[PDB]
């Protein structure tokens, strides 16, 4: 496919009609770019504001493993044990909103001004933290909001498959897990999902200052290509 439409700005009239409406992504550029975050947040930044407070942490390359675990720790011994010393295992401080917990690290991030076109209130407005080493792996699903994923730490890579595509995703047939596909996006099963091969699709690399908008229910499938960090926003 093509790459996600980068736009510098766009004014709340452009984004509502050209992109919020029909549900089409794009990155957002001159947005985020000087939040606070994006010049103080480091491992040594993190370590002094957040080191000593207790995290979920998701242990296994990918959520739908079978050897794939949540546990808990404090956020020094995730930053040690899943980044720093030589990762035995890959681990990932996912969707945990780090920033009801530690309400200093919030001042150093905004809500977007794009969200007050939806219908939902600004403090229902779930935020996300995203915190790992290279190599972390989301597989294909998709969320029942719109999301605004500002990008920090490194770079993503990111596959987006439009709702219309849901057949040849092949989402797991559980309810529970009905919202996540069977592919590995990075190395299909053709045999047992053909039809995965012709569903076209937008990628993009999201880098530190750019912010992608994800269309509610859009495909999305990330993985991180260096030490990453992301804040996601879910709203209506
Ligand atoms: C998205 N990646 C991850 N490693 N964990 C959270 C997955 C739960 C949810 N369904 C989601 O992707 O938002
Ligand atoms: O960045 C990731 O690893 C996944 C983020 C995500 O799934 C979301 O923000 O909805
Ligand atoms: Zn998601």
Known sequence: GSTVPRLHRPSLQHFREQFLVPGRPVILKGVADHWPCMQKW???????????????????????????????????EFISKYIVNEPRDVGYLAQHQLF?????????????????????????????????????????????????????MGRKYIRLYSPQESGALYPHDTHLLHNTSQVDVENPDLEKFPKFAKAPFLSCILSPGEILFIPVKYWHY???????????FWWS
Not at 50 to 65: F, K, L, M, Q
Not at 68 to 75: E, H
Not at 222 to 232: E, G, I, M, N, W
Request: proline share 6%.
């Open 222 to 232: 990330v993985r991180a290509l260096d030490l990453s960090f992301s804040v996601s």
């Open 42 to 76: 480091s491992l040594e930044y993190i370590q002094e504001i957040a080191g000593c407070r207790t995290v979920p942490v998701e242990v296994g390359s990918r959520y739908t493993d079978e050897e794939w675990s949540q546990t808990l720790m404090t956020v020094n």
């Open 100 to 152: 009801d917990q530690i309400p200093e690290l919030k001042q150093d991030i905004s809500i977007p001004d794009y969200c007050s076109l939806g219908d939902g209130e600004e403090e229902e407005i779930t935020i996300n933290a995203w915190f790992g080493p290279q190599g972390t792996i989301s597989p294909l699903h998709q969320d029942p909001q719109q999301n605004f994923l500002v990008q920090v």
